[PDB]
Amino acid sequence: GELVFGVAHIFASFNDTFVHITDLTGKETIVRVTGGMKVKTDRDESSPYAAMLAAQDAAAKCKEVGITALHIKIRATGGTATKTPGPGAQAALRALARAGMRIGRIEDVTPIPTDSTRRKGGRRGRRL
Amino acid sequence: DTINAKLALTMKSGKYVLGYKSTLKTLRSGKAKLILIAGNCPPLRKSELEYYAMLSKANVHHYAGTNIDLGTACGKLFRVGVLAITDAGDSDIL
Amino acid sequence: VVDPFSRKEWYDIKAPAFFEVKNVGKTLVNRTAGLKNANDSLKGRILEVSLADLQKDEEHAFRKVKLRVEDIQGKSCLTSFNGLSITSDKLRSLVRKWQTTIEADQTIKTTDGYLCRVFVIGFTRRRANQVKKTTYAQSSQIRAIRQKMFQVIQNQTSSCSMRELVQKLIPEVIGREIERATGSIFPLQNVLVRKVKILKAPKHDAQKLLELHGES
């Protein structure tokens, strides 16, 4: 039993992906890297390549401390929004798996509403 | 069963006493089984009536509703403060 | 500016004695210095961990319990029961079309100061010979089912305390009793406690933790 378990939150939005890694508790986190600091184009923040770059950078910084296994928890925008994880969620999962860090207890913790407040758009909606 | 219907059928077939002075007279004479006290009663009068019923071994029911509600339940157009059921008739008020 | 990891220490987390495991994981707390106590900054932490991990059996994988770290004993923090819930994947899988879902709740009290709002959810089931695909129950039957769940919860939780509450939630006796009591009504299926919430807590049980712990 020489394994150390952390908690890796993934926030897979359609605009930018968050790869947050903390300890087994909630506070006193170690690593937080997104696609914004991996690509500077302001367009490919949610790209799978940028998500995997952030995920592997998080893996390297976690291996620096010496933590082996992570309990993964992916989550979309949630609330009164799309509620669908972006393309970077699977890219981050594969990057963590490929980096050699152990993965356990996959779960989706996107915040769902019980018929929450009105969504923006104005009835007719975003007529783009 | 409810008590308003029971009170109504005691009114149809039973013996009732209205007011405070007559209720005290009935309790004093001992021909009393149940007394009904409205929620709007004076506290001193309620304590006196409870003491009278305890002395005479008569049951007390301080039902909800004002004296207006008690009179409406009794079927009268005036306010009723204290009810004294002397004969239940064919009911189970007591 | 220096490395922020030089002011951090690793401590073990000990789940309460109700479970089948002792070591759950490790935490992270900043360096203990003056005017700021690691003990003061540690007691406000919440952990989530799977009941399968706590029981060394995959029979409770969908269930996940939360613990509240309260006491520190020899650089090994001790936690207490804080609630149980069901995974989103399990809940979405359980929820299905062309069936009736009945969910109820009740607040319970233990022998000591403890207010627990426990929920329960149950779904209608087919009889392996039904030809139709509706399988719906009337609202009167739903209300009768809710009354049966209320009676079962009250009877089984009249005097248990938290020890018996944990000892009876793992084998799922509440759902079994609800299904047994619902024999005269729609058979019902997948009856389980979806979430238990904790509203009041005792005076830290500073001595009862010593009473329960101290073994192995």
Add this chain to the structure above:
Amino acid sequence: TKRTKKVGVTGKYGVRYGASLRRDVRKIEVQQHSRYQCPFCGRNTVKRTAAGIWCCNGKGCKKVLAGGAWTVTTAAATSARSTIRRLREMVEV
């Protein structure tokens, strides 16, 4: 005879002070000069004296109640009484 289409009690004010101000005063004075029921006697004999004091006559229950400016009870006070009642029950239990 109706004797007044809409002004009612504000007919003493004639044509001055404005219609909206007269209407607001009319509502206030209608509330102010109203007989209310004693919550202890059940008689519609409660009348206002000096903006916050309400008294009912009779042989009994000569109590003097502290109420609103022109109503015996205000909505805010009733809400506060319910809130205090709720808090007291939670503290006791």
Add this chain to the structure above:
RNA sequence: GGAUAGUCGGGGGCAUUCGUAUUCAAUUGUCAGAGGUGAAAUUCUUGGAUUUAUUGAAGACGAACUACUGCGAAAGCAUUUGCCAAGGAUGUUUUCAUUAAUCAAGAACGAAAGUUAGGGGAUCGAAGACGAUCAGAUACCGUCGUAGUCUUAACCAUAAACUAUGCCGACUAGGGAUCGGGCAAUGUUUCUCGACUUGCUCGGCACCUUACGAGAAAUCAAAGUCUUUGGGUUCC
């Protein structure tokens, strides 16, 4: 029409209970971007943004279950429980006995938006402010944002308020689903009842095929029973 028995209903009102989500507030952890978009851009962030973790408050709404399914005269009605009044269908060798149908005039309710005073104002968001697109964008796009969106006491009184199809009554072709009730099964199942299966019937929501029939046709079990033109009655 009324009564009676078991039911049924997301029908109405009052009181009560619960749920996550949104916003905000306090506190804790590392640091450089975060939002947003086709692309961006406004804005704020080494004074700690965003995220993660704990606690609390506010208001709104009852996701999934949720359906060619239910209720109400319609507008509409979807968290738990209790109370009150009322309602349709069903069962009935119960009661009255024509009490009936449709309506001028006159009245009740009447989504949303709009008005007058009180409370509350989380989210969204008319007006508006900026920032991108365009030749000009005054709009569609992003952020903020007043009235409004909630509620009480008074108002009005209209929507593609639609089934673009008035109400009552009789008849008319084959079948299968669904809701509520009732009847029948020496039917099945689970520690006298429920669930499921089959058949019959009444009252609804609808569906498939067809056209004896209708229409100018699209189509219609009524929009059929109309040159073979007449059951009754309003609106237009």
Add this chain to the structure above:
RNA sequence: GUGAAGAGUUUCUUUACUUAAUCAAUGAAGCGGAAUUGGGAUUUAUUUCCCAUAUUCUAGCGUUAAAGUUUCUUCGCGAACUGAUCCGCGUUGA
């Protein structure tokens, strides 16, 4: 005035005390600490870690002491203790 931490033979910052000094209340009317007292967990338990309150009432009254062991000697509405635990560097609070 008195002390504790951080710092390039010395005092910059914050962070503790009250008697200086300031404010408020009052008839400067009960501030603080000790012994039993029953729950309480240290535990083949020891006040060792914990602090506990008498008046909810209905528009009544509540004062000039009663009761107690025991002292003249029991002429006494006599003198003391207690009833009303003891103690004190602070009238109370900011």
Add this chain to the structure above:
RNA sequence: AAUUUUCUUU
């Protein structure tokens, strides 16, 4: 994203 206009007839 972005795409406005085609006089009166033969």
